[PDB]
Amino acid sequence: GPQPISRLEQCGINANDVKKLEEAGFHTVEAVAYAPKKELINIKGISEAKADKILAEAAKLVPMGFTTATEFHQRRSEIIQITTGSKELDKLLQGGIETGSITEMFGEFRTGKTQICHTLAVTCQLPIDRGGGEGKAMYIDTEGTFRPERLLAVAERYGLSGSDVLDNVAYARAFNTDHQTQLLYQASAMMVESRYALLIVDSATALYRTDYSGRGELSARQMHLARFLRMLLRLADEFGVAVVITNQVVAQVDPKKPIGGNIIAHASTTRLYLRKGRGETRICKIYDSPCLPEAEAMFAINADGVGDAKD
Amino acid sequence: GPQPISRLEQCGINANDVKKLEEAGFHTVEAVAYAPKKELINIKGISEAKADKILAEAAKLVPMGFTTATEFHQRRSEIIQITTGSKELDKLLQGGIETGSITEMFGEFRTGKTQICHTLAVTCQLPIDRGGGEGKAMYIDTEGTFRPERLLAVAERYGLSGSDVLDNVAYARAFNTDHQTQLLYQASAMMVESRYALLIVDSATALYRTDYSGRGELSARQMHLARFLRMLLRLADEFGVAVVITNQVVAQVDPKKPIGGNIIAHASTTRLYLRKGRGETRICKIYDSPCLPEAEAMFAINADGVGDAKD
Amino acid sequence: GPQPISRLEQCGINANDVKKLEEAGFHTVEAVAYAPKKELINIKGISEAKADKILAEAAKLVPMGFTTATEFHQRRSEIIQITTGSKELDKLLQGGIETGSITEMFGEFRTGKTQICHTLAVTCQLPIDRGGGEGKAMYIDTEGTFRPERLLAVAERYGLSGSDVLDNVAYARAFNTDHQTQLLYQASAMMVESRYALLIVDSATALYRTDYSGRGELSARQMHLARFLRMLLRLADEFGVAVVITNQVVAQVDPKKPIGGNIIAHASTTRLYLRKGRGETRICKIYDSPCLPEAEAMFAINADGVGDAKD
Amino acid sequence: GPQPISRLEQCGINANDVKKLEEAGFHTVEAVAYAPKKELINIKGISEAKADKILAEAAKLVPMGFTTATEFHQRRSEIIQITTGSKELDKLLQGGIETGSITEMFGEFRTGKTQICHTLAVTCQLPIDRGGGEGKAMYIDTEGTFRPERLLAVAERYGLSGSDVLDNVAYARAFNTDHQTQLLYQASAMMVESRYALLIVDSATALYRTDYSGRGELSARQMHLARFLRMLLRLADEFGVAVVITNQVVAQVDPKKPIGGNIIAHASTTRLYLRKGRGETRICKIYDSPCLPEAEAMFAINADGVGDAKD
Amino acid sequence: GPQPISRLEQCGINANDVKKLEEAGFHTVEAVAYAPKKELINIKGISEAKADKILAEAAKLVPMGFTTATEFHQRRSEIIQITTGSKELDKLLQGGIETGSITEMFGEFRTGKTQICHTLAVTCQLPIDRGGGEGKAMYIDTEGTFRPERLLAVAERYGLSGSDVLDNVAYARAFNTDHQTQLLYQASAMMVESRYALLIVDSATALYRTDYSGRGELSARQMHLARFLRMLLRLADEFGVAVVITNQVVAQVDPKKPIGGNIIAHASTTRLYLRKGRGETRICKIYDSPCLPEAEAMFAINADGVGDAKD
Amino acid sequence: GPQPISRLEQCGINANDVKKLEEAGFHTVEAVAYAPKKELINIKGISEAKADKILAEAAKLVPMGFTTATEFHQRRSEIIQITTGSKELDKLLQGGIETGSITEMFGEFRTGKTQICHTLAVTCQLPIDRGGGEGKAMYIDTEGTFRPERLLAVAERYGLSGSDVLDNVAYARAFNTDHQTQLLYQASAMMVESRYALLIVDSATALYRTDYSGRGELSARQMHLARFLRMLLRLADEFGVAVVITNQVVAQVDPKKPIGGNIIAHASTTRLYLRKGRGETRICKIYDSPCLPEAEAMFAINADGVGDAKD
DNA sequence: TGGAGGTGCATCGAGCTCGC
DNA sequence: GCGAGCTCGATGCACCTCCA
Ligand SMILES: Nc1ncnc2c1ncn2[C@@H]1O[C@H](COP(=O)(O)OP(=O)(O)OP(=O)(O)O)[C@@H](O)[C@H]1O
Ligand SMILES: Nc1ncnc2c1ncn2[C@@H]1O[C@H](COP(=O)(O)OP(=O)(O)OP(=O)(O)O)[C@@H](O)[C@H]1O
Ligand SMILES: Nc1ncnc2c1ncn2[C@@H]1O[C@H](COP(=O)(O)OP(=O)(O)OP(=O)(O)O)[C@@H](O)[C@H]1O
Ligand SMILES: Nc1ncnc2c1ncn2[C@@H]1O[C@H](COP(=O)(O)OP(=O)(O)OP(=O)(O)O)[C@@H](O)[C@H]1O
Ligand SMILES: [Ca+2]
Ligand SMILES: [Ca+2]
Ligand SMILES: [Ca+2]
Ligand SMILES: [Ca+2]
Ligand SMILES: [Ca+2]
Ligand SMILES: [Ca+2]
Ligand SMILES: [Ca+2]
Ligand SMILES: [Ca+2]
Ligand SMILES: [Ca+2]
Ligand SMILES: [Ca+2]
Ligand SMILES: [Ca+2]
Ligand SMILES: [Ca+2]
């Protein structure tokens, strides 16, 4: 997919400058074409004279102009949709989780956010014709609730070898919000060498709830969170992966809305509101989407991952 | 297990700065690697220049990058599971109370929350092959309901010398929520010198119900509680201990949910709902877990701690 | 026992600030050590700068850190247990009413709640070797059912001079729930000058049943009751007295549970359920306790207080 | 006895505010001292600032602190006990009906509840040395069964002038439960101008049996009844009158208990169970009391009120 | 006597609201003054704002406060007592059947309950000086045992024109318990236009014995019966009529008590127990009364109604 | 006479609901007007909303309000009285057996109860001017003692064609008490199509003596019997038939009273006590009646039914 | 530049004779 | 001249701030 940053050295850029770009987090020509002038001036060995030269060269390698809605409609027909393991959720999402966008799943506790992320971490490795993305999975966990035993159960359901499923899931544990963002720079490096199909941040806001406390730190909290969601969108456009983040809820005391404020509400393309039903059954509702009508669907958390209820 | 903070003085940090870290609550290199930039700037003799130097040095001592799910699945096979004294609860928990996570036990009065905490305080000292954790226990009591006589009864059941069992249980009585948190900083110091296997906070929310009263203080209450649960998670990752907190219930008037709100619901990895059965028998239900199916099991409070019912 | 608050003026606190503490209800160094930052900021002439200075000084006078369960087991062997006048209840309670905790006695009418409180008000003045507490008694009555003639009958049974027994029983009549709480601040002042062994609130919930009426006031009712039970626990830790509260019942229409809800159920360390037997005989059952098995015992209300049945 | 509310205008309260208190039912300084903050905020022209000022001023006029059981034992020796006309009932009650408390008389029909209330309405006017209370009587009838002809017969027995006996009995007929409570506010006004010794509510629960019907209204019924019994206790503490209420029975179908539930059982200090004997003779039994042993006594309904049986 | 409800429209109530009251069964100002807030909220076009306005206006038209027993003794001297046709029963009842109260007559079959009700239905039309009530009679029959031929025989005895006696007896046949109560609302309407002196319900409990069968319906039976007896008491206070109800007996198998339970025993002011003597002679006994001693009297059922025995 | 239930479909009721009423036993508008709300809720396809609509519509078709005793005296002059075949019994009953009421005939064996029922079954078919009812007869026999040969003998006495007399007597044999009641629902259906004048239940209590045995089943026995007698009264008001039931006797061992207890004694309007005289002559005595004096009369059982004795 | 759930209450209603 | 036991049903209640 994306073009390696080494193509800039052929097009008239010194390899010493390309090295300076890679240490700033740019491992692809697209990542440079998508960056403003500011993000290149901040690098040490890069001046404004080298910036326009770098951007001009990257601009003719990546198409960054106007195009017809007809052409864009053809490219969106080839977008992959990853099955959620539930036949009912796939009808609600009209195919499954969409790559190249940020999908947010929120709900109270035990609503299935970590279980959907575990099912997706396996179903993203299925062939395209089986509803997968035919790529690896990367799981950034911020709570310590990542259980490879759940992956092995989903892998048994689809007849995949559990040993190979675990080998194609990159796992990282974030311990603060700075580490959570620093993990994304390493994610860009890994998405260049091997093909990934899914990026999970579970949860994307849990650490923001305590690294920044009180209204006095509310602004800096939302600024840092907004930068985090921008690099996620960047990873989605750069590598065409599906970004699935998990969010937490808060009570309205004045009946539960997701945390993160307006930053995460605007940034998330699709938002899924998970609520508990009866027993193991749970209800997902389209809370926000550009193309999906507001509807509900009922799924279940079985011993083999997310699936459909028995009745 | 965890590496002492003194290893930073070898790696290029002034011992005067390490002293300043230890007075802020950092007694391990992991505790520094897991902390953001903010928590280090707040210390007096630490500037931003020393912060990145401190974090960079701690970052190469602790692995804080990506890894395969296969490697993580091997480390989770070595996790210890502490027996609850009941053969039925151990099947429900598929082994017992899991270290490195926060387990919440809630229920109405006399449901056995303090009795399970007393049984765990002894069974955490058993050898690994007997279902224990082979370490000391630390009991933070916020109600005054800690009874060493119950420990001696559990110790007689497992053939341990009651005099040595009491010597391996550190006990503290918290009197307010500020003291409850201040006790955790002393807990980190004690977990460095000797090996602990279990940390009990009974109850973790009782003092929040009255130190903060009314909706006008609801936000500050949940903020303080959220910070408390973060340092608990920190103690679990730093020292690999099992954190077992106890929670209280409230009636729904509109049939009893645990207090603490969404903060403690999201933070708790496993939640056990204890309800009363017949006589001395009581029923535990998996209320939340990443890997455990929602099921019930019946245990009993006998004269020798928590065990199985006679029938 | 407890250290007078005047010891803070020696340790570096201005006597004008100590005066401001005493008008807020703090008459002992322990009462200040046990209080959070919030309760000190609310006092007028106390700022945050004086708060940490006050708390730091009080923290080195009162041990508020960790200790071994062995040391705590020695201190609990010296705890006093006050005889209930009945040889059968003392076996059920394994000694009698325990000091330093809150014991709740509930039941329907005429079940003996006021009679046990009258027997305890005398037996708390016996020497330790006779089953007493060797201290005064304080009786907060909220119904007007305090009868010194019953004290004189219990005093004749134990050979005490009735004139001195009545002189060692402080009596107050509470008329509303605000007065009931305001009476506890005067109780702390009186527990400093002379040694008390027992504090009776009969009944602790009767006035809450009518000062707050309906579900619309249910929250404020339980908040006020919870604050009341916290200052009771404070009086028990500060002065090591036995707190014996009396509770009322309500019918389950859907066969009688105590009122007060989950607030008083969690707060009470020991709960005794009194029910009527035959004639003058009545049955007490351990309804909740950290160390006592659920069992029953039969006592009697004779002409000389609570005692054992004739058969 | 009680101090008029006009004493507050001398102590620093505006007479316009005192007027606002009197229209809320407060005609005595004691009635204000005994009221919580809530009952004063509900009055229109009273804010929280005026509330504490009103309560603080009333608090130094009425002793509302601790006292010795010795002092309380002296005040209870001066309590008046009103003769019931029967020499046998006076031995059972150890003197007669006690002022300052609520006495409940219940039984099936024709058991003598209305006849005892008629005898008491006359004997409460006797001099103290003859067993009376030396005050007027107030009779709140809720059934229409008040017969002044019975008062004239009791008056002839004690040699009192029947014309003056009827002049010292205030009579009111209540038609619903709201009217029954509204009558107590007028009772407080009348107890200030002239001295009363007895307040009769016959029957206190008859109208509750039909103004509130079914389990769906059971809660509101018991709430309203509980408020009624609180204002009765208030009238007993404020004016030191004897409150004698009459209650009805219900069959246990599963052998007759009084109606009203646990509300009236806890609130009543003394409960007398009247049952029919032979002919005109009837049996009273102490059903509940703080100081009276459970015993029985036989009385008779003669042509001159309640008296002793011929044999 | 009673004031028409139209007087409220003069005192500041909209005639549309008065119309809404009349369709709820309120045809008199007294009927509104005697009703609680609840009974007015249940009407459709009546809100709480209109309720207090309606009750306040009705409260100053009807005296509903305290009064002296002397004044009440004068009003009870003017109460009418209706002759029972028997000189012996009138001495037993000290005048006859008393208006403004509920008199219950019970006994086994053929004991004369329907015959006394037929004699009363005529004697209530006699002038006052002849022992009557000088008003019409209303006879609610629930058995079909109403015989105008018996009225004509009683009318011949007192020299009244039988054609006019039958014109002054309103007759209704009730077929179920709902119809029995619905008939009382029409009774209130008829008591406003013309003056009535007597209301007969024969029998008041016969239909309750079969519309509600078994213990499973016992509660609803007694609730419905209690509401019926309340509207009877209301008709007695509103219109000053004599309410004479008839009751049935049941055998004690463990020697015959009246049915209806404690509801009808408490509600009935006077209860007459009729038993069979010799031949046509029968014995009435005062079974319950506020002012009448328990005594017996012998009457007879002759060809001209209830009278005295020949010997 | 009675209006068919089909008139409700014209007045605004769905014919599907009318069908549901007819399967519950309601075949006439009167039967619905006479039923309470409860009896309509028990039907499946009938809700409370349809109940009031059904009852309101039936209420304006049947007059169910008050009326004058004069009007009721005219309707009772048109009541039919069926001759008993004996000139002496007709003078005792002042005309004969009265329609629209329940007449009970009891006595020991061979006293003529079954013979009077056979004579009535024929004389009820005579023209009105001959002392009959001009309608059919329905005979519910519970013993097997129905003999059409006795009807033919009575038919010969009155000159009726025996073949037509037997065609106008509907006969049913009841085998248990449930069947005895189930037969009455079919009786209501048959009374709608053709006009009946008499309903005989011989005997109404014989099967109750053995379907329910012992005191343990006494309550359920009397409940079932009471329901049976209510549907009989319903058939009498609905169709204006004469209900003649037969009862059995029991010895008083402590000289023979009828069985059935107080249920059948109250329910029966008229009770005839038959005793044996000399030879074929027997004596009937008015045992209970609203309008008939207690007197005796002598009749005879001849070869042609019940008649007068020869002397 | 959004953030944070809390808290139980209230009992009622009697019915049904049988067997020399 | 004396001994005999069994029977269940029902429901509705609201209010509470503060945060750099
Ligand atoms: N093997 C299993 N079989 C069935 N159900 C399971 C299994 N493992 C976990 N569950 C259930 O999955 C549910 C959802 O848990 P999950 O980890 O998805 O919660 P969550 O939404 O991430 O919550 P939180 O906010 O606490 O992190 C839990 O209720 C748990 O009982
Ligand atoms: N003058 C009198 N002489 C003797 N006995 C009388 C006299 N007046 C009333 N009694 C008796 O007093 C008894 C008790 O009646 P009372 O009014 O006290 O009943 P009660 O307990 O209030 O009943 P209820 O629940 O029906 O109101 C009755 O049995 C009545 O016969
Ligand atoms: N004209 C009359 N002359 C004499 N006695 C008569 C006359 N009419 C009726 N009686 C008698 O009146 C008595 C009482 O009958 P009544 O109708 O009053 O009974 P009851 O108490 O209502 O009975 P039940 O419970 O059956 O309805 C009967 O015994 C009857 O014989
Ligand atoms: N054809 C007849 N001629 C004369 N007498 C007859 C004739 N048939 C029957 N009897 C007499 O009629 C009398 C009454 O019998 P019946 O059937 O009426 O009794 P019963 O009261 O129903 O008795 P049981 O309680 O036994 O059923 C009997 O004594 C019988 O001898
Ligand atoms: Ca999770
Ligand atoms: Ca506990
Ligand atoms: Ca959780
Ligand atoms: Ca008490
Ligand atoms: Ca407790
Ligand atoms: Ca009475
Ligand atoms: Ca009481
Ligand atoms: Ca009758
Ligand atoms: Ca009565
Ligand atoms: Ca026979
Ligand atoms: Ca027969
Ligand atoms: Ca009858």
Numbering used by the authors:
A (entry chain F), B (entry chain E), C (entry chain D), D (entry chain C), E (entry chain B), F (entry chain A): 21 to 274, 283 to 339
Tell me what the authors wrote about this structure, in their words:
The RAD51 ATPase polymerizes on single-stranded DNA to form nucleoprotein filaments (NPFs) that are critical intermediates in the reaction of homologous recombination. ATP binding maintains the NPF in a competent conformation for strand pairing and exchange. ATP binds at the protomer-protomer interface in the RAD51 filament and promotes the adoption of a filament conformation that is competent for the strand pairing and exchange reactions.
The structure of the post-synaptic NPF was highly similar to that of the pre-synaptic NPF, in agreement with what has been previously reported. This apparent tetrahedral coordination is likely to be completed with water molecules to give more common bipyramidal coordination, which would also be the favored coordination of a physiological Mg2+ ion.
